[PDB]
Amino acid sequence: MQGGGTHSQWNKPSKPKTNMKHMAGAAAAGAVVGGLGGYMLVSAMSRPIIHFGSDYEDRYYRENMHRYPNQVYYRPMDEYSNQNNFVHDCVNITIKQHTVTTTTKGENFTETDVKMMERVVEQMCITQYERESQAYYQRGSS
């Protein structure tokens, strides 16, 4: 039966979320929830080779590059912080987009799967700070 499964999204059997196949009564901030993680279906920036739980799976990365909507989000900012920790948070926000897709049929994240995104997103998240940093070094006022 389409609509009203035992996952509600991927793995959360405790709430009667979703009643039918299509809905339109929901309206919070657009469509997403909690984390941003992009909002459009386009091409992601140049992503480097990621270290998966195994060098064997990193090969699948380029195979599911289209199945990886874990792209970076956008928002005006200028807060300086640790490139190590500050981005460690963006890693999940960037994963949110990859999570909303799970509802497609009740997808899940295994030990290796999480190693695929958690790494690619962090590594890509740090870039968000390195790109806004150069723009400041070349030009800045008040």
How many Å apart are CA 31 and CA 28, to the nearest integer?
Answer: 7
CATH code for 58-138?
A: 1.10.790.10
How many Å apart are CA 95 and CA 121, to the nearest integer?
Answer: 7
CA-CA-CA-CA torsion sign (103, 99, 31, 46):
negative
133 is written with which tokens?
């940093």
How many Å apart are CA 141 and CA 10, to the nearest integer?
Answer: 46
**Helix residue spans in the chain (DSSP H):** 58-61, 85-93, 96-100, 111-138
Domain boundaries, the chain: 58-138
114 is written with which tokens?
């999480």
Residue 84 corresponds to which amino acid?
Answer: N
Closest CA to 133 of 85, 90, 82: 82
The experimental technique behind this entry is NMR
Beta partners for residue 35, in sequence order: 33
10 Cβ partners below 8 Å, 6+ apart?
A: 99, 102, 103, 106, 107, 108, 109
